[PDB]
Design a binder for these strands. Structure first.
Ligand code: MN
Ligand code: MN
Ligand code: MN
Length: 430
DNA sequence: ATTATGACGCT
DNA sequence: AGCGTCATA
Protein backbone atom coordinates (compact mmCIF):
# COMPACT_ATOMS: atom_id res chain seq x y z
CA UNK A 1 0.00 0.00 0.00
CA UNK A 2 2.06 2.94 1.37
CA UNK A 3 5.20 1.49 -0.23
CA UNK A 4 4.08 0.96 -3.85
CA UNK A 5 6.33 3.17 -5.98
CA UNK A 6 4.03 4.98 -8.41
CA UNK A 7 6.66 6.66 -10.58
CA UNK A 8 5.26 10.15 -10.03
CA UNK A 9 8.47 11.73 -8.69
CA UNK A 10 9.37 13.68 -11.83
CA UNK A 11 7.79 16.00 -14.36
CA UNK A 12 9.15 15.21 -17.83
CA UNK A 13 8.23 16.77 -21.16
CA UNK A 14 8.99 15.84 -24.72
CA UNK A 15 8.88 18.66 -27.25
CA UNK A 16 8.77 17.59 -30.90
CA UNK A 17 8.69 19.88 -33.87
CA UNK A 18 5.76 19.63 -36.28
CA UNK A 19 6.69 18.44 -39.77
CA UNK A 20 10.08 19.88 -39.03
CA UNK A 21 12.03 19.97 -42.28
CA UNK A 22 8.88 21.24 -44.01
CA UNK A 23 8.55 24.10 -41.53
CA UNK A 24 12.23 24.95 -42.04
CA UNK A 25 11.60 25.21 -45.79
CA UNK A 26 8.30 27.08 -45.31
CA UNK A 27 9.98 29.71 -43.13
CA UNK A 28 12.55 30.22 -45.90
CA UNK A 29 10.03 30.25 -48.74
CA UNK A 30 6.69 31.89 -47.85
CA UNK A 31 5.16 30.44 -51.06
CA UNK A 32 5.20 27.02 -49.37
CA UNK A 33 3.29 28.13 -46.28
CA UNK A 34 -0.16 26.64 -45.64
CA UNK A 35 0.15 24.31 -48.59
CA UNK A 36 0.41 20.60 -49.18
CA UNK A 37 4.20 20.43 -49.18
CA UNK A 38 6.94 17.86 -48.70
CA UNK A 39 10.72 17.78 -48.45
CA UNK A 40 12.46 15.46 -50.84
CA UNK A 41 15.95 14.20 -51.28
CA UNK A 42 17.42 13.64 -54.71
CA UNK A 43 15.14 13.74 -57.76
CA UNK A 44 16.33 11.57 -60.53
CA UNK A 45 14.98 8.31 -59.12
CA UNK A 46 11.16 8.37 -59.03
CA UNK A 47 11.08 12.09 -58.26
CA UNK A 48 13.18 11.81 -55.11
CA UNK A 49 12.44 10.32 -51.71
CA UNK A 50 10.07 12.15 -49.35
CA UNK A 51 11.41 12.65 -45.83
CA UNK A 52 8.90 15.18 -44.41
CA UNK A 53 5.26 16.04 -45.13
CA UNK A 54 3.05 19.00 -44.21
CA UNK A 55 -0.24 18.23 -42.49
CA UNK A 56 -2.13 19.58 -45.52
CA UNK A 57 -0.33 17.00 -47.67
CA UNK A 58 -0.92 14.20 -45.15
CA UNK A 59 -4.65 14.74 -45.75
CA UNK A 60 -4.10 13.43 -49.30
CA UNK A 61 -2.28 10.37 -47.97
CA UNK A 62 1.25 11.57 -48.65
CA UNK A 63 3.76 9.98 -46.28
CA UNK A 64 7.41 9.77 -45.61
CA UNK A 65 9.36 7.12 -47.54
CA UNK A 66 7.09 7.71 -50.51
CA UNK A 67 8.70 8.53 -53.86
CA UNK A 68 7.69 12.02 -54.95
CA UNK A 69 6.37 10.69 -58.27
CA UNK A 70 3.95 8.52 -56.30
CA UNK A 71 3.04 11.27 -53.86
CA UNK A 72 2.15 13.43 -56.89
CA UNK A 73 -0.37 10.77 -57.91
CA UNK A 74 -2.23 11.30 -54.61
CA UNK A 75 -1.69 15.05 -54.55
CA UNK A 76 -1.09 16.64 -57.97
CA UNK A 77 -0.55 20.13 -56.55
CA UNK A 78 1.93 18.89 -53.90
CA UNK A 79 4.74 21.40 -53.51
CA UNK A 80 8.28 20.14 -53.03
CA UNK A 81 11.41 21.54 -51.45
CA UNK A 82 14.70 19.74 -52.13
CA UNK A 83 17.40 18.92 -49.62
CA UNK A 84 20.64 20.70 -50.47
CA UNK A 85 23.25 18.75 -52.36
CA UNK A 86 26.94 19.39 -51.77
CA UNK A 87 29.90 17.30 -52.90
CA UNK A 88 27.56 14.89 -54.66
CA UNK A 89 25.41 14.09 -51.65
CA UNK A 90 22.44 15.26 -49.62
CA UNK A 91 23.56 17.77 -47.03
CA UNK A 92 21.41 18.26 -43.94
CA UNK A 93 23.16 21.34 -42.54
CA UNK A 94 20.17 23.69 -42.80
CA UNK A 95 18.10 21.37 -40.60
CA UNK A 96 20.88 20.76 -38.11
CA UNK A 97 21.28 24.54 -37.74
CA UNK A 98 17.51 25.01 -37.38
CA UNK A 99 17.57 22.32 -34.69
CA UNK A 100 20.21 24.25 -32.75
CA UNK A 101 17.91 27.32 -32.80
CA UNK A 102 15.21 25.35 -31.06
CA UNK A 103 17.47 23.45 -28.67
CA UNK A 104 19.07 26.68 -27.44
CA UNK A 105 15.65 28.19 -26.63
CA UNK A 106 14.55 25.06 -24.77
CA UNK A 107 17.80 25.12 -22.78
CA UNK A 108 16.77 28.46 -21.23
CA UNK A 109 14.02 26.66 -19.32
CA UNK A 110 15.89 23.52 -18.24
CA UNK A 111 18.68 21.07 -19.00
CA UNK A 112 17.60 19.11 -22.08
CA UNK A 113 18.30 15.77 -23.69
CA UNK A 114 18.56 16.05 -27.47
CA UNK A 115 16.73 12.92 -28.64
CA UNK A 116 16.65 13.63 -32.37
CA UNK A 117 17.19 16.46 -34.83
CA UNK A 118 13.72 17.78 -33.95
CA UNK A 119 12.96 16.81 -30.34
CA UNK A 120 14.24 16.99 -26.81
CA UNK A 121 13.22 15.81 -23.37
CA UNK A 122 13.04 18.26 -20.49
CA UNK A 123 13.14 17.43 -16.77
CA UNK A 124 10.87 20.12 -15.34
CA UNK A 125 10.71 18.81 -11.77
CA UNK A 126 12.84 21.64 -10.33
CA UNK A 127 11.21 24.37 -12.44
CA UNK A 128 7.79 23.13 -11.33
CA UNK A 129 8.73 23.35 -7.66
CA UNK A 130 9.84 26.96 -8.12
CA UNK A 131 6.77 27.99 -10.09
CA UNK A 132 4.61 26.35 -7.43
CA UNK A 133 6.29 28.31 -4.65
CA UNK A 134 5.83 31.47 -6.65
CA UNK A 135 2.24 30.53 -7.19
CA UNK A 136 1.34 30.68 -3.50
CA UNK A 137 -1.53 28.20 -3.72
CA UNK A 138 -3.33 30.21 -6.39
CA UNK A 139 -5.46 28.07 -8.76
CA UNK A 140 -4.32 27.50 -12.33
CA UNK A 141 -6.51 29.31 -14.82
CA UNK A 142 -7.53 27.60 -18.08
CA UNK A 143 -6.09 30.67 -19.83
CA UNK A 144 -2.61 29.50 -18.85
CA UNK A 145 -3.19 26.29 -20.82
CA UNK A 146 -4.54 27.50 -24.19
CA UNK A 147 -3.23 24.57 -26.27
CA UNK A 148 -3.30 21.74 -23.71
CA UNK A 149 -5.25 18.47 -23.89
CA UNK A 150 -5.84 16.36 -20.82
CA UNK A 151 -5.74 12.77 -22.00
CA UNK A 152 -8.82 10.79 -20.93
CA UNK A 153 -11.03 13.84 -20.44
CA UNK A 154 -13.77 14.87 -20.74
CA UNK A 155 -15.57 11.81 -19.44
CA UNK A 156 -18.81 10.85 -17.71
CA UNK A 157 -22.26 12.50 -17.35
CA UNK A 158 -20.61 20.15 -28.03
CA UNK A 159 -19.45 18.50 -31.24
CA UNK A 160 -16.45 20.75 -31.95
CA UNK A 161 -12.85 19.78 -31.33
CA UNK A 162 -11.68 22.89 -29.45
CA UNK A 163 -14.88 22.65 -27.41
CA UNK A 164 -13.99 19.11 -26.35
CA UNK A 165 -10.51 20.19 -25.39
CA UNK A 166 -11.81 22.90 -23.12
CA UNK A 167 -14.38 20.62 -21.51
CA UNK A 168 -11.67 18.20 -20.68
CA UNK A 169 -9.39 20.86 -19.36
CA UNK A 170 -12.19 22.32 -17.25
CA UNK A 171 -12.91 18.91 -15.66
CA UNK A 172 -9.21 18.48 -14.93
CA UNK A 173 -8.71 21.90 -13.34
CA UNK A 174 -11.95 21.55 -11.40
CA UNK A 175 -10.67 18.37 -9.81
CA UNK A 176 -7.21 19.72 -8.96
CA UNK A 177 -5.98 20.16 -5.40
CA UNK A 178 -3.82 23.27 -5.71
CA UNK A 179 -3.41 23.26 -1.93
CA UNK A 180 -0.88 20.40 -2.08
CA UNK A 181 2.56 21.33 -3.46
CA UNK A 182 3.52 17.64 -3.54
CA UNK A 183 0.48 16.52 -5.56
CA UNK A 184 1.70 14.87 -8.78
CA UNK A 185 -1.35 15.94 -10.80
CA UNK A 186 -0.73 19.54 -9.75
CA UNK A 187 2.96 19.19 -10.59
CA UNK A 188 2.13 17.95 -14.09
CA UNK A 189 -0.30 20.82 -14.56
CA UNK A 190 2.31 23.41 -13.66
CA UNK A 191 4.67 21.50 -15.94
CA UNK A 192 2.14 22.02 -18.73
CA UNK A 193 1.99 25.76 -17.98
CA UNK A 194 5.78 25.96 -18.38
CA UNK A 195 5.67 23.96 -21.62
CA UNK A 196 3.06 26.39 -23.03
CA UNK A 197 5.60 29.11 -22.27
CA UNK A 198 8.40 27.09 -23.85
CA UNK A 199 6.38 26.38 -26.97
CA UNK A 200 5.30 30.02 -27.26
CA UNK A 201 8.97 31.06 -27.05
CA UNK A 202 9.98 28.59 -29.74
CA UNK A 203 7.30 29.83 -32.10
CA UNK A 204 7.94 33.51 -31.33
CA UNK A 205 11.70 33.26 -31.79
CA UNK A 206 11.94 30.83 -34.72
CA UNK A 207 8.58 30.78 -36.50
CA UNK A 208 8.39 27.00 -35.93
CA UNK A 209 5.42 25.26 -34.31
CA UNK A 210 5.73 22.15 -32.19
CA UNK A 211 3.79 19.72 -30.08
CA UNK A 212 4.61 18.37 -26.66
CA UNK A 213 3.83 15.82 -24.07
CA UNK A 214 3.90 16.21 -20.34
CA UNK A 215 4.02 13.28 -18.01
CA UNK A 216 6.09 11.65 -15.30
CA UNK A 217 8.69 9.98 -17.51
CA UNK A 218 10.12 9.97 -21.04
CA UNK A 219 8.09 7.12 -22.54
CA UNK A 220 4.77 8.64 -21.44
CA UNK A 221 5.86 12.12 -22.46
CA UNK A 222 6.77 10.87 -25.94
CA UNK A 223 3.52 8.97 -26.29
CA UNK A 224 1.53 11.97 -25.02
CA UNK A 225 3.22 14.30 -27.51
CA UNK A 226 1.81 12.41 -30.49
CA UNK A 227 -1.77 12.24 -29.23
CA UNK A 228 -2.78 15.72 -30.41
CA UNK A 229 -0.29 16.83 -33.07
CA UNK A 230 0.11 19.34 -34.60
CA UNK A 231 0.59 22.52 -32.59
CA UNK A 232 -0.87 21.15 -29.35
CA UNK A 233 0.38 19.62 -26.13
CA UNK A 234 -1.00 16.74 -24.10
CA UNK A 235 -0.84 15.96 -20.39
CA UNK A 236 -0.84 12.24 -19.57
CA UNK A 237 -1.44 11.77 -15.87
CA UNK A 238 -0.53 8.69 -13.87
CA UNK A 239 -4.25 8.08 -13.43
CA UNK A 240 -4.90 8.14 -17.18
CA UNK A 241 -2.57 5.19 -17.81
CA UNK A 242 -4.89 2.19 -17.24
CA UNK A 243 -7.53 3.37 -19.74
CA UNK A 244 -4.90 4.71 -22.17
CA UNK A 245 -2.96 1.48 -22.12
CA UNK A 246 -6.02 -0.81 -22.26
CA UNK A 247 -6.31 -0.33 -26.04
CA UNK A 248 -2.76 0.83 -26.86
CA UNK A 249 -0.93 -1.48 -29.26
CA UNK A 250 2.38 -2.55 -27.75
CA UNK A 251 4.30 -1.30 -30.82
CA UNK A 252 3.33 2.31 -30.08
CA UNK A 253 5.58 2.52 -27.04
CA UNK A 254 9.08 3.71 -27.66
CA UNK A 255 11.50 0.82 -28.03
CA UNK A 256 8.76 -1.74 -28.70
CA UNK A 257 8.22 -0.88 -32.35
CA UNK A 258 10.57 -3.60 -33.57
CA UNK A 259 11.48 -7.23 -32.92
CA UNK A 260 11.16 -7.10 -29.12
CA UNK A 261 7.64 -5.70 -29.36
CA UNK A 262 6.71 -8.38 -31.86
CA UNK A 263 8.11 -11.04 -29.55
CA UNK A 264 6.09 -9.68 -26.60
CA UNK A 265 2.95 -10.03 -28.73
CA UNK A 266 3.80 -13.50 -30.03
CA UNK A 267 5.16 -15.09 -26.87
CA UNK A 268 2.52 -13.77 -24.50
CA UNK A 269 -0.37 -13.79 -26.96
CA UNK A 270 -1.44 -10.23 -26.19
CA UNK A 271 -2.01 -7.02 -28.18
CA UNK A 272 -2.18 -4.05 -25.81
CA UNK A 273 0.21 -2.47 -23.33
CA UNK A 274 -2.27 -2.86 -20.49
CA UNK A 275 -2.37 -6.63 -20.89
CA UNK A 276 1.24 -6.80 -19.64
CA UNK A 277 0.09 -6.09 -16.06
CA UNK A 278 -1.03 -9.71 -15.67
CA UNK A 279 2.48 -11.14 -15.76
CA UNK A 280 4.90 -11.24 -12.86
CA UNK A 281 8.18 -9.38 -13.12
CA UNK A 282 9.95 -12.75 -13.09
CA UNK A 283 7.71 -14.01 -15.91
CA UNK A 284 8.59 -11.04 -18.10
CA UNK A 285 12.28 -11.35 -17.22
CA UNK A 286 12.18 -15.01 -18.16
CA UNK A 287 11.07 -14.19 -21.71
CA UNK A 288 12.71 -10.85 -22.45
CA UNK A 289 15.74 -10.77 -20.15
CA UNK A 290 16.37 -9.18 -16.77
CA UNK A 291 16.54 -5.58 -17.95
CA UNK A 292 13.69 -5.71 -20.47
CA UNK A 293 11.47 -7.69 -18.12
CA UNK A 294 11.86 -5.21 -15.26
CA UNK A 295 11.36 -2.33 -17.68
CA UNK A 296 8.16 -3.88 -19.10
CA UNK A 297 6.79 -4.69 -15.65
CA UNK A 298 7.08 -1.06 -14.57
CA UNK A 299 6.27 0.50 -17.96
CA UNK A 300 2.88 -1.17 -18.34
CA UNK A 301 1.97 0.42 -14.99
CA UNK A 302 3.05 3.87 -16.26
CA UNK A 303 6.41 3.77 -14.47
CA UNK A 304 9.86 4.32 -15.97
CA UNK A 305 13.05 5.68 -14.45
CA UNK A 306 15.23 6.51 -17.47
CA UNK A 307 16.70 9.94 -16.70
CA UNK A 308 16.65 12.90 -18.94
CA UNK A 309 20.29 13.12 -19.82
CA UNK A 310 22.00 16.45 -19.80
CA UNK A 311 23.14 16.32 -23.39
CA UNK A 312 22.21 19.04 -25.85
CA UNK A 313 24.79 18.19 -28.51
CA UNK A 314 25.11 15.06 -30.65
CA UNK A 315 27.97 12.80 -29.44
CA UNK A 316 28.87 11.69 -32.97
CA UNK A 317 29.19 13.53 -36.28
CA UNK A 318 28.72 11.31 -39.33
CA UNK A 319 28.48 11.40 -43.14
CA UNK A 320 26.97 8.57 -45.19
CA UNK A 321 25.90 7.76 -48.73
CA UNK A 322 24.18 4.83 -50.38
CA UNK A 323 25.14 3.71 -53.87
CA UNK A 324 22.06 1.73 -54.91
CA UNK A 325 21.36 -0.47 -57.92
CA UNK A 326 24.03 0.00 -60.54
CA UNK A 327 25.58 3.15 -59.07
CA UNK A 328 27.50 0.85 -56.71
CA UNK A 329 31.20 1.68 -56.60
CA UNK A 330 33.21 -0.80 -58.66
CA UNK A 331 36.57 0.94 -59.09
CA UNK A 332 39.27 2.13 -56.69
CA UNK A 333 39.28 5.74 -57.87
CA UNK A 334 35.50 5.77 -57.46
CA UNK A 335 35.74 4.50 -53.89
CA UNK A 336 38.48 7.02 -53.17
CA UNK A 337 36.61 9.90 -54.75
CA UNK A 338 33.55 9.33 -52.60
CA UNK A 339 35.60 8.80 -49.44
CA UNK A 340 37.06 12.23 -50.11
CA UNK A 341 33.62 13.76 -50.63
CA UNK A 342 32.36 12.31 -47.36
CA UNK A 343 35.61 13.31 -45.61
CA UNK A 344 35.37 16.86 -46.85
CA UNK A 345 31.85 17.28 -45.49
CA UNK A 346 33.01 15.62 -42.26
CA UNK A 347 35.97 18.00 -41.97
CA UNK A 348 33.71 20.99 -42.51
CA UNK A 349 31.24 19.89 -39.84
CA UNK A 350 34.00 18.83 -37.44
CA UNK A 351 35.84 22.13 -37.72
CA UNK A 352 32.64 24.07 -37.08
CA UNK A 353 31.91 21.79 -34.13
CA UNK A 354 35.33 22.39 -32.60
CA UNK A 355 34.90 26.16 -32.77
CA UNK A 356 31.31 26.16 -31.47
CA UNK A 357 31.53 23.50 -28.81
CA UNK A 358 35.11 23.34 -27.49
CA UNK A 359 35.69 19.68 -28.24
CA UNK A 360 37.62 17.42 -30.60
CA UNK A 361 36.73 14.01 -31.99
CA UNK A 362 39.43 11.35 -31.51
CA UNK A 363 38.18 8.27 -33.35
CA UNK A 364 37.13 7.77 -36.96
CA UNK A 365 34.69 4.97 -37.71
CA UNK A 366 34.49 3.70 -41.28
CA UNK A 367 31.58 1.56 -42.39
CA UNK A 368 30.67 -0.01 -45.71
CA UNK A 369 27.95 -2.15 -47.20
CA UNK A 370 28.65 -4.66 -49.91
CA UNK A 371 26.26 -5.74 -52.67
CA UNK A 372 24.25 -8.78 -51.62
CA UNK A 373 24.28 -8.04 -47.89
CA UNK A 374 20.80 -7.39 -46.47
CA UNK A 375 22.27 -5.76 -43.37
CA UNK A 376 22.47 -1.98 -43.01
CA UNK A 377 26.21 -2.33 -42.45
CA UNK A 378 28.47 -5.07 -43.76
CA UNK A 379 31.64 -3.97 -42.00
CA UNK A 380 32.70 -1.38 -39.43
CA UNK A 381 36.32 -0.52 -38.59
CA UNK A 382 37.82 2.25 -36.49
CA UNK A 383 41.10 4.12 -36.67
CA UNK A 384 42.61 7.15 -34.96
CA UNK A 385 41.31 10.60 -35.80
CA UNK A 386 44.25 12.87 -35.01
CA UNK A 387 43.80 15.73 -37.49
CA UNK A 388 40.79 17.50 -38.96
CA UNK A 389 42.05 16.97 -42.50
CA UNK A 390 39.76 15.55 -45.19
CA UNK A 391 42.57 14.08 -47.29
CA UNK A 392 44.11 12.34 -44.28
CA UNK A 393 40.75 11.03 -43.10
CA UNK A 394 39.83 9.67 -46.54
CA UNK A 395 43.25 8.11 -47.01
CA UNK A 396 42.92 6.50 -43.55
CA UNK A 397 39.39 5.26 -44.30
CA UNK A 398 40.65 3.62 -47.48
CA UNK A 399 43.45 1.91 -45.58
CA UNK A 400 41.05 0.35 -43.17
CA UNK A 401 38.76 -0.97 -45.88
CA UNK A 402 41.41 -1.85 -48.45
CA UNK A 403 41.19 -5.51 -47.81
CA UNK A 404 37.49 -5.89 -48.36
CA UNK A 405 38.16 -5.80 -52.09
CA UNK A 406 37.99 -9.43 -53.25
CA UNK A 407 39.04 -8.69 -56.83
CA UNK A 408 42.39 -10.09 -57.92
CA UNK A 409 43.55 -6.91 -59.62
CA UNK A 410 43.44 -3.80 -57.45
CA UNK A 411 42.02 -1.25 -59.90
CA UNK A 412 38.60 -2.90 -59.66
CA UNK A 413 36.52 -3.14 -56.53
CA UNK A 414 34.46 -6.26 -55.91
CA UNK A 415 31.95 -6.93 -54.76
CA UNK A 416 30.81 -3.34 -55.47
CA UNK A 417 30.18 -1.00 -52.53
CA UNK A 418 26.58 0.03 -51.93
CA UNK A 419 27.29 2.29 -48.94
CA UNK A 420 30.09 4.41 -47.47
CA UNK A 421 29.93 5.92 -43.97
CA UNK A 422 32.38 8.08 -42.04
CA UNK A 423 31.73 8.87 -38.40
CA UNK A 424 33.69 10.93 -35.94
CA UNK A 425 33.36 9.77 -32.36
CA UNK A 426 34.96 9.90 -28.92
CA UNK A 427 34.99 13.61 -28.20
CA UNK A 428 37.36 15.17 -25.70
CA UNK A 429 37.19 18.72 -24.39
CA UNK A 430 39.50 21.15 -26.18
C1' DA B 1 16.31 2.21 -55.01
C1' DT B 2 13.70 5.48 -48.89
C1' DT B 3 18.19 7.79 -47.45
C1' DA B 4 20.87 10.02 -43.97
C1' DT B 5 21.58 9.94 -39.94
C1' DG B 6 22.23 9.04 -34.34
C1' DA B 7 21.93 6.58 -29.60
C1' DC B 8 22.23 2.53 -26.90
C1' DG B 9 22.68 -2.56 -25.87
C1' DC B 10 25.12 -7.13 -26.32
C1' DT B 11 29.09 -9.97 -26.10
C1' DA C 1 35.81 -3.36 -30.48
C1' DG C 2 32.30 -4.68 -33.85
C1' DC C 3 27.57 -5.94 -34.39
C1' DG C 4 22.63 -5.41 -33.84
C1' DT C 5 18.40 -2.95 -32.66
C1' DC C 6 15.47 1.01 -32.69
C1' DA C 7 14.68 5.40 -33.61
C1' DT C 8 13.77 9.97 -36.42
C1' DA C 9 13.70 13.98 -40.57
MN1 MN D 1 8.50 16.12 -35.42
MN1 MN E 1 10.70 13.76 -33.84
MN1 MN F 1 8.01 11.61 -37.73
Amino acid sequence: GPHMATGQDRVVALVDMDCFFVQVEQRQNPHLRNKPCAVVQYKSWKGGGIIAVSYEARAFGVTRSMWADDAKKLCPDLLLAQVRESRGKANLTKYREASVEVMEIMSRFAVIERASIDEAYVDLTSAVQERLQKLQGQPISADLLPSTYIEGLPQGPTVQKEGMRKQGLFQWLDSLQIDNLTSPDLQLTVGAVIVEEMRAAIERETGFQCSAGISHNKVLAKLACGLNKPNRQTLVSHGSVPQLFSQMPIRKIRSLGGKLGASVIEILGIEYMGELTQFTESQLQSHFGEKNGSWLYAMCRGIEHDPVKPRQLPKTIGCSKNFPGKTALATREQVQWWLLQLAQELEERLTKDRNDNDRVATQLVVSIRVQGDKRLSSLRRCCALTRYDAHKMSHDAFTVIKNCNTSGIQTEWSPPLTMLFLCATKFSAS
